[PDB]
Design a protein around this ligand. Structure first.
Ligand SMILES: C[S@@+](CC[C@H](N)C(=O)[O-])C[C@H]1O[C@@H](n2cnc3c(N)ncnc32)[C@H](O)[C@@H]1O
Ligand SMILES: C[S@@+](CC[C@H](N)C(=O)[O-])C[C@H]1O[C@@H](n2cnc3c(N)ncnc32)[C@H](O)[C@@H]1O
Ligand SMILES: C[C@@H]1CCC[C@H]2C=C[C@@H](C)[C@]3(C(=O)NC=C(c4ccccc4)C3=O)[C@@H]12
Ligand SMILES: C[C@@H]1CCC[C@H]2C=C[C@@H](C)[C@]3(C(=O)NC=C(c4ccccc4)C3=O)[C@@H]12
Lengths: 387, 387
């Protein structure tokens, strides 16, 4: 129709006329519109069929299809793709028709196939690893959650060793320990750590204001990245503030510090092995930084992580929690969906600002400031002090 | 933003100004815009989390939440919903926050919850049974499809007894035979038959023109509804053409014929047990009607169903296949997602018009006419004859 093409042109121009935050708001609006305009039968069909996207992406990842197509300068027919990748000719045709219909690939007028934005996305190793994670680790736990809750008469999950994960994988270990005994899952998890989210807290964090008159002399630590993974926060901080004095220290487990050496700068950033369930060794640091750490633990273990940092803090020291802060109402699907997944797999939860302050007050901490850096799904650097 | 409120208002106004087929066109466009405007991270996030909708709908169905909430005139808080339904208060709060973020319920400004269009949909018994089918039957099969295809080096699936269903449910039976041994699944499937798709083929089927000079005397059958389920097509046939003479015969297995006696009209429609894998007993009927039957069977088994009807046809007899007819290009997600699902669970496929004629030709049949009655996802009544 001419009406739908005018809608498309119009929303495209609006999207190009705003920033990434405006586009994310428009995308949420398009989603709400779809749900409001669908027939009752469309609703059931949508819930049933959108499940195929992860399964079909997983297949195409297994075949190298997205990485392959991303490197093609000319449209590819189904037959030449089936033959180059080792897939049955009829199976490939059907996968591609489904993929094109959800824009996983683009289909041409002569029934050939080029890459779309999603094809390029699924070719990026860190992002492909997120999709594979969702298939092999998230799906079994979501599949087990409804019968788990029914057998337990619908409890409030607060224990990482008593959730749907234990039923889904027939184990009594928590997810973290169980993952170490699985080599193929660790390999995908290692690639997941190389994906860097953008934007990051340094786009709005007023470091010079939060610094105040704090002195790095003699050799105090400016930034202690606790569970910092590949050290992306450390790297970005030195990049944005190359003249600010103080040690910048990456803290994680020895296996991931070794992997992080491939991409760390030759100097500037220290690598310090540390299990954050043990007392913090670095004393008097200005910023103790926890990005997407505490979300992965129930309140009682998340508190224990904080209590292990408190004894090392001066009056000028701050604990910076960089994590989701969903609002008390109007929370979006990306910050409530995650809440259901980590409940089912880790026994943890997303936390509103109020729940973050209540958790922190138990460790003797007080919220000094909150600096949001994504919208409309809230990620914020929360700055906590003592007293 | 004011911008997204204006987008919603405008697309709502457009959606009300058109028919259901126009609304479906707009919805597909909104989906395409959403996928094209998401960031790479959004894409992975969407694939990871849209899974939760099926799991959470299953939980709400288990608790009776959607049926209960559809009967409430005033908004309900999480605490009172949790108490009435026997669910943890915190668990219920997190379920409701997730559901509200995907319009499964509606959240109010005072953080209470009321029904949405989707809440009402999930309260309808046949549509709830469709969602429950997707959870317990479909996506175990989808969870098994990638490893199944990888182990088998990506074959063309053509056999109902050698597909992802056998690995998902650790059986050697095909899906239909296995289902008959599962009482809880059969019950849900029985409820699923109560849902009547709308619109139906009688909205565009020119009965009188196709009938022509056909004579019902002595006692020929006008309409034989093969695998007709609850008999919805028979009922709507008698409602729209009450004066048309000829028998109208509902053919199905005794279990569903028995369950269909509740909603069948007292007279007009005969109930005749018949297994469509055996020769057709009604001789010389005008219309042999197969709605959403042959889509569930691979080519060789679909052909046997037709080969069993051909020997009972007159020159005036027609076989009417009412089923999906996807296009050769530009097929929609609702007709390609079904294809992947039935491939994985039943070894069957969706069929273009060309594949339907190829299959019918092998039974001695010839396409006479094709009457679409849905758009843009195509369902049509295809009229076949001998020679
Ligand atoms: C979400 S991942 C990395 C997130 C990282 N802070 C970022 O935003 O870039 C969580 C990190 O915590 C680390 N981790 C898990 N358990 C730990 C422990 N007991 N001690 C220190 N680090 C741990 C993991 O190695 C992983 O790198
Ligand atoms: C798609 S469902 C019902 C479709 C129905 N024609 C409609 O559109 O309303 C398939 C139907 O075929 C019936 N069926 C399955 N196997 C059969 C068989 N071997 N013989 C006769 N009916 C069968 C089931 O009982 C079920 O009612
Ligand atoms: C990190 C990934 C990144 C891609 C997918 C995301 C989905 C939400 C949670 C599901 C995340 C999250 O936010 N935190 C940790 C878990 C997790 C879930 C199960 C097992 C192990 C970890 C997650 O997947 C998150
Ligand atoms: C009818 C249901 C109603 C709710 C879900 C729908 C989406 C997938 C299809 C595939 C449906 C469909 O349209 N056709 C056949 C199956 C099916 C799959 C496995 C076993 C038995 C049936 C389906 O669930 C369809």
């Amino acid at each position: 129709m001419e009406t739908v093409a005018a809608i498309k042109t119009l929303i495209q121009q609006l999207a190009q006329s705003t920033d990434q935050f405006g586009r994310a708001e428009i995308n949420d609006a398009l989603r709400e519109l779809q749900y409001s305009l669908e027939t009752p039968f469309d609703t059931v069909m949508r819930m049933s069929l959108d499940t195929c996207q992860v399964a079909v992406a997983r297949i195409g990842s297994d075949l190298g299809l997205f990485k392959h197509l991303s490197q093609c300068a000319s449209p590819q027919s189904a037959e030449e793709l089936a033959d180059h990748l080792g897939c049955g000719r009829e199976l490939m045709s059907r996968l591609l028709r489904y993929m094109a219909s959800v824009r996983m690939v683009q289909q041409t007028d002569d029934i050939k196939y080029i890459s779309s934005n999603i094809t390029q996305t699924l070719a990026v190793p860190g992002l492909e690893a997120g999709m594979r994670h969702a298939f092999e680790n998230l799906w079994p736990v979501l599949m087990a959650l409804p019968d788990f809750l029914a057998e337990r008469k619908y409890p409030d999950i607060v224990d990482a060793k008593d959730t749907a994960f234990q039923k889904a994988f027939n184990t009594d270990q928590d997810c973290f320990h169980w993952l170490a005994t699985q080599p193929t899952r660790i390999a995908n998890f290692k690639v997941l750590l190389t994906d860097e989210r953008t934007p990051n807290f340094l786009s709005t964090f007023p470091l010079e204001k939060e610094l105040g008159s704090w002195s790095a002399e003699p050799e105090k630590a400016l930034f202690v990245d606790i569970g910092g993974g590949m050290g992306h926060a450390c790297i970005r901080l030195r990049e944005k503030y190359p003249n600010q004095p103080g040690r910048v220290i990456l803290q994680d487990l020895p296996p991931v510090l070794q992997a992080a050496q491939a991409t760390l700068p030759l100097s500037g950033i220290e690598s310090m092995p540390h299990n954050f369930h043990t007392p913090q060794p670095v004393q008097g640091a200005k910023f103790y930084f926890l990005r997407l750490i505490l979300r992965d633990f129930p309140d009682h273990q998340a508190l224990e992580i904080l209590q292990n940092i408190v004894p090392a803090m001066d009056a000028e020291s701050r604990i910076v929690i960089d994590d989701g802060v969903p609002p008390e109402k109007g929370a979006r699907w990306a910050e409530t969906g995650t809440d259901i997944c980590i409940m089912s797999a880790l026994g943890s939860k997303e936390r509103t600002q109020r729940q973050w302050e209540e958790l922190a007050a138990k460790a003797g901490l007080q919220l000094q400031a909150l600096y949001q850096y994504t919208w409309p799904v809230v990620n914020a650097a929360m700055v906590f002090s003592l007293q």
